[PDB]
Amino acid sequence: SDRRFQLLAAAERLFAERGFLAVRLEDIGAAAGVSGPAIYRHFPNKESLLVELLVGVSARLLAGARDVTTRSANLAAALDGLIEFHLDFALGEADLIRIQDRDLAHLPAVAERQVRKAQRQYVEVWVGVLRELNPGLAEADARLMAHAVFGLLNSTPHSMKAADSKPARTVRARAVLRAMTVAALSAADRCL
Amino acid sequence: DRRFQLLAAAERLFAERGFLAVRLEDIGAAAGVSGPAIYRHFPNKESLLVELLVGVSARLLAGARDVTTRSANLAAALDGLIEFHLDFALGEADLIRIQDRDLAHLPAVAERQVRKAQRQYVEVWVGVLRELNPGLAEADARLMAHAVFGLLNSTPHSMKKPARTVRARAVLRAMTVAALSAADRC
């Protein structure tokens, strides 16, 4: 059964810690508790794991952002939902942030284009909601604000190690990052 | 001066294509230096990456120290550190991309030097934030500093014009100052 899930979770942890190039498929097997030849029943190579991890996360973030905006009762609730969604992602998946930043170039060209397309469309969901909320907002300003918020929230791999896996650390980090994000978007809004 | 032309080409190409995909001859080509002439200046790609990253990490730390040296009080020191990092993020998007993506491609000795200078840069910010707010835990001050670097270092994604620079400076400064005030009151 979900030996497939155990291999993906090990690949995610090891790619984040050591980087894609330094990690061997059998290291992923080892960490998952899958014997060397058993690994190749699930994945042919390292590249196939990286493709699944990054094509996966980028498509799911885009789908999640669309779901948030679809289910939102008004535009203010849509922006609040997008902030809460990205916050949960940054605190819960710091490993996938680190990998998608540092190892995008190791994807096959087709997978790289898929990931960059899903990233661009995720940004467009935020830009669309920001401009609808602030009819004065230029495209270029909305893009600057959205990228600034992703930069703020996606800092979690630098700030959050094994240490802050305590639930009290997670909720404190979440509250501080949410307050920073909401204040940053308010200041941008009153400056344009 | 050919040494600077090779470094500037290496910076542009490493940012665009990533360290591994770039050849020394490509750097030579872009700089307008013939193949064998390159090796009078740099023995390999690695030596260019070392100079780029040892350089930027030492200059950021020295600039942060200069800001805290010249400041009459801690409020002025934080304002100065924000202005300094903003100038860096708007002027040096290529070095941000490289330092993020390609640190692991340094020789071990250079990697330790760059990670030490990065850690000491973060410690200048953390030191100022904790002196300003003695109630701030180490972990919270580190979270706030990395959040500000993430906000400011978003410039490669948002900035392909002088008019773009002026506008981005005003918006990113307002976002950063408001973010650090909200963190403090939380």
The dihedral formed by the CA atoms of B66, B69, B72 and B74, expressed in degrees to the nearest 10: 80
Best residue in B111, B122, B148, B151 for a mutation probing chain A (most A CBs within 10 Å)? B151
Please answer whether residues B15 and B98 qualify as being in contact, where contact means their C-beta atoms are separated by less than 8 angstroms. yes
DSSP secondary-structure letter at A73? Answer: S
Mind telling me how many Å the CA of B1 is from chain A's nearest CA?
Answer: 32
Residues B30 and B60 in one domain: no
Say which residue the tokens 């030579």 belong to.
Answer: B28
Concatenating the DSSP letter of every residue in B124-140 gives: HHHHHHHHH-TTS-HHH
Contacts of residue A22 in chain B, CB cutoff 8 Å?
Answer: 104
CA-to-CA distance for A67 and A77, rounded, in angstroms? 13
Residues B108 and B175 in one domain: yes
Phi and psi at residue B136, in whole multiples of 5°?
A: -70, 120
DSSP element (H, E) containing B119 = helix B108-132
The answer to whether the CB atoms of B151 and A148 lie below 8 A apart is: yes
CA-to-CA distance for B89 and B173, rounded, in angstroms? 11
What number of other Cβ atoms are within 10 A of residue B43's Cβ? 11
Concatenating the DSSP letter of every residue in B31-72 gives: HT--HHHHTTT-SSHHHHHHHHHHHHHHHHHHHHHHHHHH-S
Tokens of B174: 């307002």
Q: Which of A4, A3, A97, A118 is nearest to A55 (CA)?
A: A118
Query: From the list A19, A150, A180, which residue is nearest B104 (CB)?
Result: A19
Tokens of A39: 């690994």
Contacts of residue A143 in chain B, CB cutoff 8 Å?
Answer: 158
Q: Which of B143, B134, B147 is nearest to B82 (CA)?
A: B147
Q: Go through A17-28 and write b for each residue having 16 or more CB atoms within 10 A of its CB, e for each that does not.
A: eebbeebebeeb
Contacts of residue B182 in chain A, CB cutoff 8 Å?
Answer: 179-180, 182-184
Q: Which of B14, B95, B94, B5 is nearest to B41 (CA)?
A: B5
Mind telling me how many Å the CA of A148 is from chain B's nearest CA?
Answer: 5
DSSP secondary-structure letter at A19? Answer: -
CA-to-CA distance for A25 and A5, rounded, in angstroms? 14
CA-to-CA distance for A31 and A42, rounded, in angstroms? 15
Query: In A22-166, which ranges are continuous DSSP H helix?
Result: 25-32, 36-39, 46-71, 75-92, 94-102, 109-133, 139-153, 156-159
Residues B96 and B165 in one domain: yes
The answer to whether the CB atoms of A148 and B142 lie below 8 A apart is: no
Tokens of A65: 């952002």
CA-to-CA distance for A177 and A83, rounded, in angstroms? 10
CA-to-CA distance for B75 and A177, rounded, in angstroms? 22
Closest CA in chain B for residue A157: B146
Would the CA dihedral through A87, A93, A98, A104 be positive or negative? negative
Say which residue the tokens 């830009």 belong to.
Answer: A127
Radius of gyration of chain A (CA): 18
Say which residue the tokens 């040096």 belong to.
Answer: B92
Would the CA dihedral through A33, A37, A41, A43 be positive or negative? positive
Closest CA in chain B for residue A100: B101
Closest CA in chain B for residue A139: B158
Residues B8 and B51 in one domain: no
Domains contained in chain A, number: 2
CA-to-CA distance for A85 and A66, rounded, in angstroms? 11
DSSP secondary-structure letter at B106? Answer: S
- Which distant-in-sequence residues (6+ apart) come within 8 Å of A33 by Cβ? A6
Tokens of B181: 């005030």
Residues B86 and B172 in one domain: yes
Residues B8 and B83 in one domain: no
Please answer whether residues B5 and B28 qualify as being in contact, where contact means their C-beta atoms are separated by less than 8 angstroms. no
Residues A32 and A103 in one domain: no
Closest CA in chain B for residue A180: B179
Please answer whether residues A139 and A131 qualify as being in contact, where contact means their C-beta atoms are separated by less than 8 angstroms. yes
Q: Which of B94, B92, B90 is nearest to B171 (CA)?
A: B90
Say which residue the tokens 């009762």 belong to.
Answer: A73
Phi and psi at residue B41, in whole multiples of 5°?
A: -105, -45
Please answer whether residues B181 and A183 qualify as being in contact, where contact means their C-beta atoms are separated by less than 8 angstroms. yes
Please answer whether residues A31 and A21 qualify as being in contact, where contact means their C-beta atoms are separated by less than 8 angstroms. no
Q: What is the domain extent for residue A33? A: 1-43
CA-to-CA distance for B176 and B170, rounded, in angstroms? 10
The answer to whether the CB atoms of B146 and A155 lie below 8 A apart is: yes
Mind telling me how many Å the CA of A23 is from chain B's nearest CA?
Answer: 13
The answer to whether the CB atoms of A158 and B176 lie below 8 A apart is: no
Best residue in A87, A89, A143, A152 for a mutation probing chain B (most B CBs within 10 Å)? A152
Would the CA dihedral through B47, A104, B57, A188 be positive or negative? positive
Q: Which of A116, A86, A123 is nearest to A101 (CA)?
A: A116
Experimental determination technique: X-ray
Residues B47 and B76 in one domain: yes
Mind telling me how many Å the CA of A41 is from chain B's nearest CA?
Answer: 31
DSSP element (H, E) containing A172 = helix A167-189
Can you give the resolution of this entry in Å?
Answer: 2.0
Tokens of A80: 């609040």
Tokens of B164: 């773009």
Residues A39 and A51 in one domain: no
Length of chain B: 186
Say which residue the tokens 């490493």 belong to.
Answer: B14
- Which distant-in-sequence residues (6+ apart) come within 8 Å of B172 by Cβ? A144, A148, B86, B89, B90, B151, B152, B155
Calculate helix-pair angle for B74-91, B138-152, nearest 10 degrees: 40
Residues A33 and A52 in one domain: no
Q: Give the A:B interface size as CB pairs under 8 Å.
A: 116
Residues B25 and B53 in one domain: no
| Helices (runs of H) and strands (runs of E) counted in chain B | 10, 0
Please return the burial class of A55, using the count of CB atoms within 10 Å of its CB with bins 0-12, 13-18 and 19+: middle
Residues A91 and A32 in one domain: no
The torsion region of residue A43 among left (phi > 0), alpha (psi -120 to 50) and beta comes to beta
Query: From the list A144, A155, A158, which residue is nearest B168 (CB)?
Result: A144
